[PDB]
Chains A and B, each alone.
Chain A
């Protein structure tokens, strides 16, 4: 794996990939 520059929807796609059907929580800040 390589370090990643992820912003916006690009971050939720990365999460989706890594967690798959295990699913995840998306929690930005304020």
Chain B
């Protein structure tokens, strides 16, 4: 899901914001 994607592909700060508490 998130960890993998930012690393194998690319990811945006908006996607990352989903993991915030």
Contact = CB atoms under 8 A, between A and B. Distances in A.
Contacts of A15: 16, 19-20
- Interface footprint category on A: 20 to 34
A15 B1 CA distance: 15
Interface residues of B, number: 16
Contacts, number: 57
B16 to A, nearest CB: 5
B11 to A, nearest CB: 6
Interface of B: 1-4, 6-7, 10-14, 16-17, 19-21
Interface of A: 1, 3-8, 11, 14-15, 18-19, 22-29
